[PDB]
């Protein structure tokens, strides 16, 4: 018993047959944190217990979100999401704000709890089933079933949208200057206000959300020593690019002339006049690699010409709402990472990087994980969708640690890859 509203019939995408994923191992802490948060929900009957008779399944893990509220269980509904039907509501019903990127500050607000207020289709409830594990497999894992719009499910924001809509109508109305967006269990609020005026209008919003549909957001713990909270805000205007292309040497040797062409010959796909013909001419014979330094000024001229084409508003790019999005990472240096996001290959609509903040959080995975979390966010704020990630790491690996360095309410799609040196220049 929760909402006198009538349950909206949800059917899965034809042919598919609901999630049947297995529950990967969880640490004690996480188990407890998961147990607690879980039972208090059965008490409120947000979810019911269920036995073996329910074959379907999806996994859960909880993350230690650094906020003065509590923990956070996270169902990995990426499976059921693709198994689940479409939603004309999630698309046109939820258009995407141009100016979300254009603002000075955008805050992320976990409007998750605005979900318990709506029951899930009785017929559908078998699919959103998860299962808590147990230390050394004492007693068997207790299984639950969702009875209301579940946290992180392609439907929760669709069905609940016409509501979320009215809830913000007052706020978005008395703050036109502000830009609000909805993506999964999150609200992307952005204003051009002074940061202190923003941090005060979010809390302005972070309270209206209360007197209305008891939408409880998280209470974050701010502190003193190394002020991370001061970083929590997001500034999309402050976002840069990556036209760092241009190489530069005085003693141009064979190796350096070849490396430059290899990299420049491939770039011909990402830029117009990438004419590297006269450069090939300089390395005409079986010249001694390591020493020969043909300084030829002949090339110097059109080498500067190619340099020109490498820093400008690329011709060819375009965002097709239709096609997916892709994001590619590469361990580029010391704690430095870079990313390219594209739809139709070799015509990326945005490139950036990731440099671990000054601090003792050195862990190759941890950076990659965090990195992904960043590339994801940019996509949400910019095009309003989520990139699919080709992760430069071993699947078997990333599976052992990604939970321990992930903080978002959402989890994007990802595969694994080992692409050799060209993908770094």
């Amino acid at each position, epitope marked *: 018993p929760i909402s006198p509203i009538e349950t909206v019939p949800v059917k899965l995408k034809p042919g598919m047959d609901g999630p049947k994923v297995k529950q990967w191992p969880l640490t004690e802490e996480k188990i407890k944190a998961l147990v607690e948060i879980c039972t208090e929900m059965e008490k409120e009957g947000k979810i019911s217990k269920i036995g073996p008779e329910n074959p379907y399944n999806t996994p859960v893990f909880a993350i230690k979100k650094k906020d003065s509220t509590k923990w956070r269980k996270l169902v990995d509904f990426r499976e059921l999401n693709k198994r689940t039907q479409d939603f004309w509501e999630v698309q046109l019903g939820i258009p995407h704000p141009a100016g979300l990127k254009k603002k000075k500050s955008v805050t992320v607000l976990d409007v998750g709890d605005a979900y318990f207020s709506v029951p899930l289709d009785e017929d559908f409830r078998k699919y959103t089933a998860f299962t808590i594990p147990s230390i050394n497999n004492e007693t068997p894992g207790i299984r639950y079933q969702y009875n209301v719009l579940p946290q992180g499910w392609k439907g929760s924001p669709a069905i609940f949208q016409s509501s979320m809509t009215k809830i913000l109508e007052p706020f978005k109305k008395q703050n036109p200057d502000i830009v609000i967006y909805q993506y999964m269990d999150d609200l992307y609020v952005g204003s051009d206000l002074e*940061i*202190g005026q923003h*941090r*005060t209008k979010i809390e302005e919003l972070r309270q209206h959300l209360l007197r209305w549909g008891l939408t409880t957001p998280d209470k974050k713990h*701010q502190k*003193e*020593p*190394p*002020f*991370l909270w*001061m*970083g929590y805000e997001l500034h999309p205007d402050k976002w840069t690019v990556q036209p760092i292309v241009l190489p530069e040497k005085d003693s141009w040797t064979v190796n350096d002339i070849q490396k430059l062409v290899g990299k420049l010959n491939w770039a011909s796909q990402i830029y117009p006049g990438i004419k590297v013909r006269q450069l090939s001419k300089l390395l005409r014979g079986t010249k001694a690699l390591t020493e020969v330094i043909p300084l030829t000024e002949e090339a110097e001229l059109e080498l500067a010409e190619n340099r020109e084409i490498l820093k400008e508003p690329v011709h060819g790019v375009y965002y097709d709402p239709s096609k997916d999005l892709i994001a590619e990472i590469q361990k580029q240096g010391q704690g430095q990472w870079t990313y390219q996001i594209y739809q139709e290959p070799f015509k990326n609509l945005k490139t950036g990087k990731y440099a671990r903040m000054r601090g003792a959080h050195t862990n190759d995975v941890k950076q990659l994980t965090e990195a992904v979390q960043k590339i994801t966010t940019e996509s949400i704020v910019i095009w309003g969708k989520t990139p699919k990630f080709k992760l430069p790491i071993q699947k078997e690996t990333w599976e052992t640690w990604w939970t321990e360095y992930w903080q978002a309410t959402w989890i994007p799609e990802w595969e694994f890859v080992n692409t050799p040196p060209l993908v770094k220049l």
Partner: antibody
Amino acid sequence: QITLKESGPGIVQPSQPFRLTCTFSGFSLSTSGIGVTWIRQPSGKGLEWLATIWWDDDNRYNPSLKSRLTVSKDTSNNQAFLNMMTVETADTAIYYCAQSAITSVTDSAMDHWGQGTSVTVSS
Amino acid sequence: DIQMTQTTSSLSASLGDRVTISCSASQDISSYLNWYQQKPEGTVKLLIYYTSSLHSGVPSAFSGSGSGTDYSLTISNLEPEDFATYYCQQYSKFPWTFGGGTKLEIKR
């Protein structure tokens, strides 16, 4: 612009409590990053940190004195108080109220002070 | 209670001289340090935050320096105003502590 002046009893008998009030202007004890601190420089010595009153109501006291001292503020009136009970000799000194504020990820210092008030303790 | 120590208590100088004051911490303070100046009159202005960043208004001659349990404040060419007491402060552990300042007197 930004300013904060401290006001106290000037003179307080031993074993009696006192309460210095710091009024301020320019900034606000309502804005995220801000705050105010009470420093204490005893007559011919270095300044000492006593307590910082934080905007988020999470004030911090010096371990040596919380058992006798407290902080609070009425942001509405732009005042910041500092209460210390059962006062002793040693405590008699100039007390400073100071506007502190977390600027960003790593910046945190007492941005602007004020001309301390003289609390003298004696029979 | 990170203990803060300003080894040099009162240093001697002259208009033009180069002053550097040393400040040591009980434990690492990850550059969480501020420099406070106090005129003979008795007013305290903020000199620099992050043991390196210049406060506004403060002149360029002033400069932070340090890493870890040690840091230093350096005045390029001394001036009249600049002859005052200096307070070293750390904000790593919350019990905010200032290390008993350093007196900068005029040599005679």
